């Protein structure tokens, strides 16, 4: 996942 960047 992209912690901080949920738009990954």
């Amino acid at each position: 996942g992209c912690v901080x960047y949920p738009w990954c």
Side-chain angles (χ1 to χ4, degrees):
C2 270
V3 288
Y5 329 95
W7 56 81
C8 271

